[PDB]
Design an enzyme around this catalytic site. Sequence first.
Site, PDB file in Angstrom:
ATOM      1  CB  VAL A  92     106.246  26.812  30.892  1.00 26.43           C
ATOM      2  CG1 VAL A  92     106.457  25.537  31.195  1.00 26.43           C
ATOM      3  CG2 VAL A  92     107.253  27.475  29.797  1.00 26.43           C
ATOM      4  CB  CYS A  93     101.423  23.969  30.406  1.00 29.65           C
ATOM      5  SG  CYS A  93      99.896  23.662  30.880  1.00 29.65           S
ATOM      6  CG  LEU A  94     104.873  23.643  36.258  1.00 31.54           C
ATOM      7  CD1 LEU A  94     105.496  22.034  35.828  1.00 31.54           C
ATOM      8  CD2 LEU A  94     106.394  24.402  36.812  1.00 31.54           C
TER       9      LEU A  94
END
Lengths: 157, 65, 156, 78
Positions: A91-93
Site C-alpha cells: 500500500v502506497c500512502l
Amino acid sequence: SGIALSRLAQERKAWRKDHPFGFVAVPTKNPDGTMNLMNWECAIPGKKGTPWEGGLFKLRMLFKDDYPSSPPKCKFEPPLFHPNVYPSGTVCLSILEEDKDWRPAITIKQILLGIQELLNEPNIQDPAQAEAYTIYCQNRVEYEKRVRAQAKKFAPS
Amino acid sequence: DDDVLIVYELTPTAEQKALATKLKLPPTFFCYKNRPDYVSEEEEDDEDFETAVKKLNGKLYLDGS
Amino acid sequence: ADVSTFLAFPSPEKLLRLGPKSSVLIAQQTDTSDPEKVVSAFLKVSSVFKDEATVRMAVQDAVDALMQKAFNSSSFNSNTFLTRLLVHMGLLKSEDKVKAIANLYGPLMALNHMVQQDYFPKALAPLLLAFVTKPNSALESCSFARHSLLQTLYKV
Amino acid sequence: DHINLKVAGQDGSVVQFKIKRHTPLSKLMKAYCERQGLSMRQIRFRFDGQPINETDTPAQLEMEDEDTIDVFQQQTGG
C-alpha cells in the site's frame, strides 16, 4: 528503538478492548507459540456507501525494531485492484512514508482507518499500478464495476 | 469578555501519560483504563486471525445496535 | 562474445558491427523468460535508434527478434514486462530504485514499431496508451516520437 | 445561546468546547488546532459525515449540546 516490542504489546492490548467495528488486527505466532509482534494479519472492511462496501480486505503489517520511528510496511494479501496499490500488494500512502506524513504517534488503528480511507479516495497523479490507473482514467464506470466485483469477491462469511 | 472556550478535554493519569510518552503514543491512548466497565484483566491471547474474522459473522457495519 | 560487449555499452556503431545476424544474436543472448531482463535488453537496443534506414531497420529487427521470442512463451507475463518497462522509462513509480534515462526517443520509436507488429499483445495497448498520455517532462522532450506513437495506438 | 461541542480526533483526543450558536466555527477550529499543536490546512473537520466551513455556525448546522465533530489528518496515496 527499544520500545518497538513493548509498544506493539500495548497496541495489541488496547485493540482488544477498543477498536473500530469491522476491522481485524491479529499478530501472528512465533513457532514457540508466542505472538510475533513484527507481523500482523489484518482485515479492512470496505466503507459503507462506496463501491468498496461489503468486501473485507486482508492486509499484512510488517514492522521492524525502529518502530515507531519508522512506519510498518503494509501489503494487501492478495494484491488489490487500486491505483495506489503495487502489484506486490504494497500500500502506497503518505502516512506510511517515513518522511512525508508518517509520525510516531500514528497508531495501527489510524493506519487501518487511513488505509480504509485511501480505498475510495485514490490519488491518480501518482499511481502505484498500471492496470487500475488505466481503467479509472478510461471509463470511470467500468472502474467502479471492477471495484464492486472485487468487494463481492472479498465479501466475508 | 469573550465567546469560544475549552471547558473540557480527555486527560490521562500521570502514570498513563508517562507510558504513552515512553512509547511515543498519543497521550489519551490508555484512557480506556479509566472507563467504569474496564476490567484490569484480560485472558492470555491465543486467538488466531481466522477466528477473529469468523467472529464477525459477516457483519461489517452498524445499525440500530 | 562481442554481443556481450555491446550490451554493456550500446552504440549505433557496435550494433551494426555485429553484422547481418545481430537480431538473433541478441534474442539468443538474453533470458526471455524474465521480463526485467527483456526490458533491460529492449532499452539498451532502442537507445541506439537513429531515423536513418540502416540503423532504424537494424534496431526494429532486433526488437522484433527479441519480442517475438518472449510473447510466445507461456513463461512470459506481458503485464509484468509492460509494467517494468514503464518503470524504467520513468513513467511509473516502483518500490525498487532504478536509474532512469535521459532520452526516450529511441524507446518510443521502438515501441511505435513493436505495437503495429502482429505478435504484439493488443490487450497491452490501452495500458501503454495511458502512460504515454500521462504528463512527463521526458516524454515532452521528444514530442514527435510521443505523438507518432500515440497516433499508432489510437488506431487499435 | 450557550452550547457544548465535542471535537474528537483520530488519535482519540477529545476536546470539548463551550460556544454560542451564532458563533462561526473558524475560531473553534483555530483554537482546536492550536491546542493540539497542528496546522489547519493539514487537518479537516466534519459533521454528520459532511465537511464544515469557516463561515458555518451551529445555527446553520443545527447543532446539539452534547454533539461531536470529527477531525481528519490529511493523507494522500502515491
